[PDB]
Amino acid sequence: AKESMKNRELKRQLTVAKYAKKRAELKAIIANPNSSAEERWNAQVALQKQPRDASASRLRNRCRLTGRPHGFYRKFGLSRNKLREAAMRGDVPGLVKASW
């Protein structure tokens, strides 16, 4: 959880979000059955133009306080070993211990 590594994933977040439209248009044109092989191929070229650091697959979500790559809960934003610490203090609304 080195801060350089957090910085380089946050910058990945900006790089992914800052296009947000050329990916959609190009992939929609590619997946459109009636667009001709020319618009297939130019769209492939266009997709290969932009940096690889733009896709959502490259984006590994992390804890917002520690950045632990493992043990994530996307309903919250915290990691495995901070969600419990915050919950025992009652900070998380409507969270208790369950028996049933």
Next chain:
Amino acid sequence: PRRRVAAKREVLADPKYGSQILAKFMNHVMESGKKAVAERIVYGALDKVKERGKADPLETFEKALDAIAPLVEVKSRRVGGATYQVPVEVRPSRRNALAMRWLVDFARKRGEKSMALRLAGELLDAAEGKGAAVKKREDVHRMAEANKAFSH
């Protein structure tokens, strides 16, 4: 259990015959909770018994269990240096359990088309005693006289 507070549940759900031993035999032949499979298999076996056997099949069944139940059972006890065996009279409730278990486990080992006619075959064999279950019963019985020395 050391406490001896564990009571027993009573099961009696004979569908049509309204008997008692039949249901316990059902449970013995039931495997992995396949109760209806046991229903149809045992009832086909009993139908074959009824068509082969002139009389009703339930008294033939109880007579067959009468010839498989062991009167005495041998049980190993170690004297502290030697491996002995001791013959003891079987608990009256335990006789039916041994009878059912032996009959089922011996009907399982025939090797013919299905175990319905296997169960019929050993039900008729045990009706007088030319089967293999009666063979094991008499072997276990004769082990008692073979070890009558200790008894006490």
Next chain:
Amino acid sequence: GQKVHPNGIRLGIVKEHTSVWYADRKNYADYLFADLKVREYLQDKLKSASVSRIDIHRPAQTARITIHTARPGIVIGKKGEDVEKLRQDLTKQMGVPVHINIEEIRKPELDAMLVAQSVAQQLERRVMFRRAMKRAVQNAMRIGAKGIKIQVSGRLGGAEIARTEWYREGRVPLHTLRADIDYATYEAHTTYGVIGVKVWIFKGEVIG
């Protein structure tokens, strides 16, 4: 063995959550992040003031913060030139507008967080820990406090081996859910490492 957090096990039963609002699949994570950031920032900034409970409420697109402190004079100085800067800063952090209400708490020696902080800052000043434990326990027991336990762990003094000490007085039943056991932990940073302080305070039974 280990013991469950006494505040968490009593959540809903006798204790109350420190952040009461409602959110949905989108804004829930953002609201939790804002709450955690605001709480740590407020604690760090008003460390000098004796702040214990930061209660957060969220009405429609708004936010209300109430502060439980033993010293309200520092925050409320010469008719409001302090809380307003805080309001503006919190609105810089919290997108929604904020609202502040400074709540003063009597009997600070009956609040676990304050006792823990005082003991920790005493140990930071190279004071013997047994004297601090005795003084805190006696101060707590002069008024109310049907029971109190204080535990301190670490390299007490300057020894190069860690150990744990604790002193109790009265009754502190942790296995009874009716009892509202106030509980707190804190860390004291010394030249030889970290010292952990835990405080349990028993107020009374809740009946009916």
Next chain:
RNA sequence: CGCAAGGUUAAAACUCAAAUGAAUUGACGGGGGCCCGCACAAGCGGUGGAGCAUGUGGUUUAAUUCGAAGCAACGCGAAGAACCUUACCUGGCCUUGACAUGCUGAGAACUUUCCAGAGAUGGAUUGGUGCCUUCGGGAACUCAGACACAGGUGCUGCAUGGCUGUCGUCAGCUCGUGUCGUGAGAUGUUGGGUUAAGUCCCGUAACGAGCGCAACCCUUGUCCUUAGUUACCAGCACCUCGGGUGGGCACUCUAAGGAGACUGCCGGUGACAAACCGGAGGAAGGUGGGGAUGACGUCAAGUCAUCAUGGCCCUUACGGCCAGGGCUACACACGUGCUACAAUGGUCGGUACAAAGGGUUGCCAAGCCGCGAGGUGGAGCUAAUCCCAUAAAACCGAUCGUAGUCCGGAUCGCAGUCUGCAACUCGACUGCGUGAAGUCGGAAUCGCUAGUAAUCGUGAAUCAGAAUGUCACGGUGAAUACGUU
């Protein structure tokens, strides 16, 4: 002295800082006595044999990145390694730096649609000179320089905090005052019963108290009150025969508040006590079933790699950026699993009944085109309202006839679908064809006492994709317990 064995009298050098007696607390015993626990015993089903998944040890490699090591490591951190993750290797590329503050100068961010480069990067690139103005100026943002710095998943868990396992959910562990002993200490807390319990009763130099046990919390099983849409349909009517429609507050159901179970009543035993064994009633009877809850402490137990922190260490590098590769390697060994070795079965046809949950950077219906995984399509839904979504084992009829087979599916060849910049290393499924080991498994070893075992299916987390793993929910549904050596 004695026949001999040997007896009697009896030193020193040297060497050590102890040797020793009695009693106390604990631990232990192939010492004793009571009691408990799937601990045995009585049963059911497995592992160890075969194929495959997954982790570990060892070997090789450029790396196979770290950590976890009897029970208490080995489907463990990891609730998801194609790139990223990533901490390792090869090569390329930076030096106050990807990031914080402090000084100086130039200026907007933005949008610039191009070239070289595996890429970091370097060089053109129309456009705007900004906001507010003490109109002087100023805040923010980008770049250049300079130091104080920044940085480290680098070592020490035997310097620490926090968190966790374990004995063990076993019934114990202590204190004040008093008393006994020269003291370490002891009584309380021993004893007769009884209980799941240091639970309770009676006695009693002890009298009282605290942390444990029990109770308060959640859920499940009965009933009552309120509630009736999107949930329900007993009655009435219409109906195109779909609670479909009008309609109702009957019912189920959903969710809030209450009643009820307390050895309460009767019989016997019992020191006429605690309690035990029966009976009635009751949906439930003896803490009704399950959960959460883990005392004083032990193992210098685990973690410095989630985090924080005392020290020590590098600063052109042990700090950063980018391409590929490895963590999925392979003469072997071990743990945990899935599938089988078949007839209580494998195929074919139509057929009936669940619970739980997830969905507006989402579910994705109808229709149409494909044997097929899928594709176009766009409906409904912020959801008891629409979608995921057809449960399966079970039952009836037909066939196979016990044969390594109408079993079993590994392996392999060819051709495909889908997400992803990209499926060689190294993804999941689909179609045709090929078709293995396996005939129920040695020494040894494991889990389980009633909705239990066994067996059948469904859902969620992580997640673009990837589950035989984890967590969770229902269907069918047993056998056995005389007893404590």
Next chain:
RNA sequence: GCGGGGUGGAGCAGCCUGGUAGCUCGUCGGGCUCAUAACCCGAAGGUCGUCGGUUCAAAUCCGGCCCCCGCAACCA
């Protein structure tokens, strides 16, 4: 020249009386144990000295040869 023999890496059964090679110690792997030793269970490893003949067929029956012995004997 008398008598006896030859088979897993070492040592014994199987011959006789024809068709079937097992056992012990070793090596390897795995069990038991907190761990080691002891102990238990698997696996590999022998076409039987060789040649010829008998014999339907041979580790087995007969001989040639070779080797081993107990050998008397030999013993610089």
Next chain:
RNA sequence: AAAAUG
């Protein structure tokens, strides 16, 4: 009935 050692 077996059980040597650290």
